[PDB]
Membrane protein TMS1d (Drosophila melanogaster), 1095 residues
Amino acid sequence: PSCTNASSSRFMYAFILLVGTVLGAIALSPGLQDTLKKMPFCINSSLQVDCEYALGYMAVYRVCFGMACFFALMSLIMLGVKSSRDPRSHIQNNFWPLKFLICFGAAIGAIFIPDGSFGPAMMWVGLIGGLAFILVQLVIIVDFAHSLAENWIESAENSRGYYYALAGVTLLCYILSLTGITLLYIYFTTSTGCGINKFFISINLIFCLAISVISILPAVQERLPHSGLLQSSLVTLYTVYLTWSAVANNPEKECNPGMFGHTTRVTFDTTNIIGLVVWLLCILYNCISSAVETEGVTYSWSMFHLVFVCASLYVMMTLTNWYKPHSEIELFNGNEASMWVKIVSSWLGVFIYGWSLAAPIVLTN
Amino acid sequence: PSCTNASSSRFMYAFILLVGTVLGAIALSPGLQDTLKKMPFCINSSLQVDCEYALGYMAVYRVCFGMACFFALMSLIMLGVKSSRDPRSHIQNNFWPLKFLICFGAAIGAIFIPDGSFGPAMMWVGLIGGLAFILVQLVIIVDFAHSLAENWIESAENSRGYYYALAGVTLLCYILSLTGITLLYIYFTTSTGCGINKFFISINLIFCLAISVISILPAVQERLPHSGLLQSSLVTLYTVYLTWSAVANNPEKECNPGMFGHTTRVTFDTTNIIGLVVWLLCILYNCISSAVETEGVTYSWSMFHLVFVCASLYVMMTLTNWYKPHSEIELFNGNEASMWVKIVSSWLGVFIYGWSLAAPIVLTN
Amino acid sequence: PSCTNASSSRFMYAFILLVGTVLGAIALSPGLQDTLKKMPFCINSSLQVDCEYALGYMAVYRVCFGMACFFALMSLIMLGVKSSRDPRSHIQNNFWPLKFLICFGAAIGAIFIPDGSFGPAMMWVGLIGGLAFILVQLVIIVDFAHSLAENWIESAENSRGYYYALAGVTLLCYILSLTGITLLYIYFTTSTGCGINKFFISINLIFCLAISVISILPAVQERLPHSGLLQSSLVTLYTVYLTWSAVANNPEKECNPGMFGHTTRVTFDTTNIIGLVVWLLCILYNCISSAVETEGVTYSWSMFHLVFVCASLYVMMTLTNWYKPHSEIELFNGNEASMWVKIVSSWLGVFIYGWSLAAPIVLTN
Ligand SMILES: CCCCCCCCCCC(CCCCCCCCCC)(CO[C@H]1O[C@@H](CO)[C@H](O[C@@H]2O[C@@H](CO)[C@H](O)[C@@H](O)[C@@H]2O)[C@@H](O)[C@@H]1O)CO[C@H]1O[C@@H](CO)[C@H](O[C@@H]2O[C@@H](CO)[C@H](O)[C@@H](O)[C@@H]2O)[C@@H](O)[C@H]1O
Ligand SMILES: CCCCCCCCCCC(CCCCCCCCCC)(CO[C@H]1O[C@@H](CO)[C@H](O[C@@H]2O[C@@H](CO)[C@H](O)[C@@H](O)[C@@H]2O)[C@@H](O)[C@@H]1O)CO[C@H]1O[C@@H](CO)[C@H](O[C@@H]2O[C@@H](CO)[C@H](O)[C@@H](O)[C@@H]2O)[C@@H](O)[C@H]1O
């Protein structure tokens, strides 16, 4: 009755966000839209280089602003709700076409916003939202790892069917992370040119070893028996991903060969694909009867919409490769304020996991 | 059954007003529509300067007139209702697409109204509606402040979690208001040129201090214990906002540097954004099971629609920056009849709050 | 169940008539449609002056003919009904989109009717319908005045809240009527040129004084205590309105300064706006559970549709300012057959009220 319709609503909102992202990403195609994008919002006209070179980025900004506003509004409405008997529960579950048309309407109206001062404000808002959503998806990954490891250990160790896979998953994740760290050492640093990259990569490797060291010692396993190695494995893979994605945006042509060492600067590579896939997996696991974010409500109706606002901003930032608006083309898709945010996010996430796993042991002895 | 559908209707009307405002504001874009707006309603042709320079303003007038008429009509229908069993309750809750199409139909029909005598009449109607809605939203803000302060004081003071925030909110609002009053002193007045601004700002500061002085004395707190400082803080912030918005329209180029000291005169700044945000918050708090505006009806079905008529007129005025139609471009977006209305509204609002807070104390001793 | 759906139907028919009137009045715009109106129905071509000068008038005729036919047909169907159990009750309440599409379909089909002999026949039909609907709305106004005066006197005189308003309404209506009669004396007559206007205005003033004299004497109040002054006040205001609207169409350039003393002759002034507002108020008060026009039916299903036919014809006539088709432009929007109909309607209405108020007193003594 009520619960199944509420969960169907939780999935309908995910479908809304998905349709919005797919519609936003149809832009920035190499030649199929970069000439069509000249009509919609540059009729108003360091501004000229941005209107002339990167059109898909502006289109993505104007599209995702609409979804951010829609989900912020839905968060403001569903504020203070206590039980499923409130009259506002009736508007969250029934009227779907109105919601679709409002969301898209907002996108179409926002596309008319001219350029000149809209860029940088949204860059800062996107940085904040990206930090928030990175931390949220780290929490989701940790919860999923706990659940999976516990389930396989409890249900499978009576047999030999899943134990092999239980070892193989963590072995494959470790070898992927190690090959990735070696590829970083090989490519994204020189002999004596860039030291900051040799600092970032090395300190992330140190944290990724200390985390798996602390995750196994028996004093922690005494409280919960399933400390295992899978959790630390998935976490270290994710942290290596963030290390690579953060070093990718180094605004120094001395060493960085990614972009620095052409009629456009909009690019789409394997990095963005991996990012979107991890994003989608986290969003779907958030909606499957989970709160890893009659009387009583399972999930707070406002925190859910706030999480979707953060997710929409994260998509805004990751589809545009975290660039700085109104910058000359020689700088070419790299800013300095994004790498620090990403790497501080990675460090805070490693701290969160290492603390939540071994807080009382350190508090006592 | 009945109540949940009635509240869903109260929110559907807010969605109607929101869609109308968003559609009205897509106009007045700097170059994306100012050339398209030449066909619709100037084919008829101090009138020529208005048709040639400010097209977005006329489009906004013609759009918002339709919503004003629609909500006035809905107010006239739902007149005299007593209980939820009347046959007219069936038409207020069910037929939504007809209502959407009637409202938009009215907008599309009104866009055909030619120029020449339509402007000034609507300017006066908009002034009256703006006065009414400013006072309404002041009442809503005062009620919200009472509710929030009472809730936090009663539920939180047993702990230390919210007391810090209870002090921080009022501290932040006070520092914002003080920095704003200082910025007004710095910018919107000269040494010896404009004295009327040094009068308005100073007298508003005097009222904003006396209000917080009276809000704290123990004789008033004897009746209600939660007199506090949050109410006076939010009220003084709102009054400083109105002081700034009223001084912005001074029709004197001697001192005012806002607009006085270009192919168009339609502008959109941070002032309009703050105005629209406060507007939206007040409209949403009006609809959340509140009447701060089986047998018996919670809210009078006609007063609600009258409040929405006033709200639509207020949007009409604030999206067009309160200008005077059919005025030469040198005057440039400033009239004299708006500043007096805004400031008299501010003074009457301060009087309303100061009276409602300390009426019986003054009546007795 | 049945009653609420029947009343919703009574309001849906009013919405149909409103949408039809709004669509008909979008025409006759000064330049926005007078060039577009050259294609639709003059491809067929004292006829040429009407096709060349007044296009909005013909468009309004062709539009309102469709609604007249639709409501006449609905009147013919719902003939002889006795109870709410007849099978024809099922078609009056359910199938709305079909009705909308039939009505508009009829309008679109009627727009194809060519010119040459369609004008004058519809002028005479419109005169008859206008007489009928003027008398109907007079009856509605009298009933409303009785209801309002009785309600305020019975519920309010225990207090002092509404007595002031009960006097103020009648005072304001009297002063409006007197200023109007003086403005007529000043403007619409000369010193010795037009005597027929000095006859009409003076005799209407005499009737409007005698009516208020008879409405107060105690012999009439003996039967019903609420004879009062409000009824006579609203009635005399309405009669002064009809006097002004009838004198406006005097086909004499000697005195009349309204139109007599330009590429078109279609005009739209404050007269038409007041007319449409009074029309809308009467139509809405007709539908609010009233018959001022299980077993048993409250309102006769055929008389309602006949009243709407008369209303549609009245709108047809008042949107076109009661002009004579196929007349030379020098005559310019004034005919002689309309003023007599309007003024005879006014006199018959004053007679109806004066009789219904004081019939038995005169019959006995
Ligand atoms: C829920 C809310 C729904 C809101 C809907 C709003 C719809 C707004 C439509 C906006 C839009 C299409 C783009 C839409 C993008 C949508 C993206 C959707 C994405 C997801 C799917 C309309 O395109 C217009 O194009 C015009 C081309 O002539 C037509 O003009 C016809 O002839 C006219 C002769 O005067 C008549 O006047 C008009 O009547 C006619 O028609 C217009 O009819 C037409 O509307 C904008 O197109 C633009 O095209 C350019 C010429 O390429 C226009 O001209 C430029 O303007 C100067 C300004 O400074 C420039 O400096 C200059 O270069 C140039 O002069 C622009 O002005 C603008 O119009
Ligand atoms: C629920 C109610 C629904 C009611 C719907 C009503 C729809 C009314 C449409 C109105 C409108 C579009 C704008 C609509 C704006 C909508 C805004 C919506 C906003 C939210 C989304 C129709 O545009 C017309 O444009 C014409 C252009 O030629 C076409 O003419 C075609 O060829 C013809 C050859 O003779 C045929 O005769 C016709 O048959 C053909 O088709 C018309 O077919 C077309 O309809 C008005 O456009 C205007 O365009 C201009 C030329 O730019 C027209 O010419 C001007 O008029 C003089 C007058 O004095 C001017 O002095 C002069 O400069 C010029 O001569 C205008 O007259 C007017 O037409």
Observations:
- Residues B 39-40, 43, 105, 108-109, 111; C 23, 26, 31-32, 35-36, 38-39 surround Lauryl Maltose Neopentyl Glycol (ligand 2) (CB under 6 Å).
- The interface with chain B takes residues 40-41, 43-45, 76-77, 79-80, 87-91, 98, 102, 105-106, 109, 112-114 of chain A (CB under 8 Å).
- Chain A has 13 helices and no strands.
